[PDB]
């Protein structure tokens, strides 16, 4: 069955790699076809074109830390004609508004972030989907952390 012929990829987070965000394509409903490669944890575009890029991460924390914690999710492009990470999509989220567990209780918190947009890419471009606090990464369920692209 022809996935379609269009370069595409939908990689998901590896739960067996605690503390970090490693993407894999060897799972249930994941994709890595028609040329796009997963190299050094980055997706590599196989041809000139317009691409839909997206990603979602789910942060989870038990009770609240100190001062203030910031969660950032961002998709970068390192172009073949300009080898430097330049942000394409990015968001920030503040889970614990300094609440900090008074001393009794402190329930868990969940904070998801979605990113997505269309971009002109060169053959050879490298796309990265990174976060700043991989220690809060909740990849316990399944479709909670993903990163993908489809050539439109």
């Amino acid at each position: 069955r022809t996935p379609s012929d269009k370069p595409v990829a939908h990689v998901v987070a590896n739960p067996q790699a605690e503390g970090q965000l490693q993407w894999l394509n060897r799972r249930a409903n994941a994709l890595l076809a028609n040329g796009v490669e997963l190299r050094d944890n980055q997706l590599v575009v196989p041809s000139e074109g317009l691409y839909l890029i997206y990603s979602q991460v789910l942060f989870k924390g038990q009770g609240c830390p100190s001062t203030h914690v910031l969660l950032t999710h961002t998709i970068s492009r390192i172009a073949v004609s300009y080898q430097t990470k330049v942000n394409l999509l990015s968001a920030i989220k503040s889970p614990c508004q300094r609440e900090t567990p008074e001393g009794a209780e402190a329930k868990p918190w969940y904070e998801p972030i979605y990113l997505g947009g269309v971009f002109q890419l060169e053959k050879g471009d490298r796309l990265s989907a990174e976060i700043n606090r991989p220690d809060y990464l909740l990849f316990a369920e399944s479709g909670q952390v993903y990163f993908g692209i489809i050539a439109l």
Partner: protein
């Protein structure tokens, strides 16, 4: 990692047909089931202490549909034995999946004491000959069978996705209770078997998860950089066998090395002059997702 299901009915000496089922995660026995002749149904004889079957939603229910398979396989074996040119001692249903380094897949085939018979294809939703010989369209092997719909669902479903989902639950519950991962040592040697020109031998030493796959690729394809790029395409010098790499039936020269939990492998290749770059050995294993190894002459 590996998840393998083995269902087997045998004609035994003279009389009844015995039935057994084995559930193996890597080289760890998880479940054993055998057909009770007194009761006329299966019984779980063994269950690994670390496997809570309730935490594995994708492991088939009804004790792996044992009664269903035992019965349908018994029927299939009887039919197979009518044409005296096929008569066999036993019949086996081999199905499971694997995540060997970067490689991953699932399988489901039926073999006989005489050798591989038919392989089930998820795409065509039917069995396909594994040998030139062909296979008798009887029992669980033909769409003609009244229970075909169940075969498609139990075997096809598991192979289509069920297994790949289940294997992850086993991994979770196995984490601490089995041999730890162990990275192998690799060396490629360029010996020479006299009559032929050159011979390459890739040897992988003492690695834990016993599943290992090897790919021989002409070095030209690595355009100077010896790293196997995940989504990249590579022509690969296929091996010759009725089995496809990944299926437990594929011939890999693996032996559990001396008093230890680890295993060792030796893969040889006939460096015929047909090529034009001298293959390089690419090793797929849990440790080192996929590494490339070179040199001949003897390195």
């Amino acid at each position: 990692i590996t998840l393998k299901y083995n269902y087997t009915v045998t004609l035994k000496d003279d009389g009844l047909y015995d039935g057994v089922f084995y559930d193996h995660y890597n080289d760890q026995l998880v479940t054993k089931i055998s057909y009770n002749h007194e009761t006329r149904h299966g019984n779980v004889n063994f269950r690994a202490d670390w496997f809570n079957i309730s935490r594995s939603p994708h492991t088939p229910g009804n004790d792996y549909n044992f009664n269903f398979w035992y019965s349908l396989m018994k029927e299939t074996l009887e039919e197979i034995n009518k044409n005296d040119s096929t008569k066999t001692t036993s019949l086996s249903l081999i199905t499971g999946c694997y995540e060997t380094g970067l490689l991953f897949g699932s399988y489901g085939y039926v073999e006989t004491a005489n050798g591989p018979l038919a392989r089930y294809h998820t795409g065509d939703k039917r069995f396909t000959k594994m040998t030139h010989k062909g296979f008798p369209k009887v029992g669980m092997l033909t769409v003609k069978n009244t229970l075909w719909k169940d075969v498609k669902a139990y075997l096809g479903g598991f192979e289509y996705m069920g297994c790949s989902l289940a294997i992850l639950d086993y991994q979770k519950m196995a984490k601490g209770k089995i041999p730890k991962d162990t990275t192998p040592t690799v060396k490629v040697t360029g010996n020479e078997l006299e009559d032929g020109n050159m011979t390459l031998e890739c040897t992988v030493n003492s690695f834990y998860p016993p599943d290992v796959i090897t790919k021989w690729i002409e070095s030209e394809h690595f355009k100077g950089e010896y790293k196997y790029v995940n989504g990249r395409y590579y022509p690969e010098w296929g091996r010759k066998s009725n089995y496809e790499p990944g299926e437990p039936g594929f011939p890999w020269n693996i032996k559990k090395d001396k008093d230890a939990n680890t295993y060792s492998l030796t893969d040889l290749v006939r460096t015929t002059s047909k090529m034009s770059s001298q293959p390089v050995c690419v090793v797929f294993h849990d440790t080192l997702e996929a590494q490339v190894y070179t040199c001949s002459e003897g390195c």
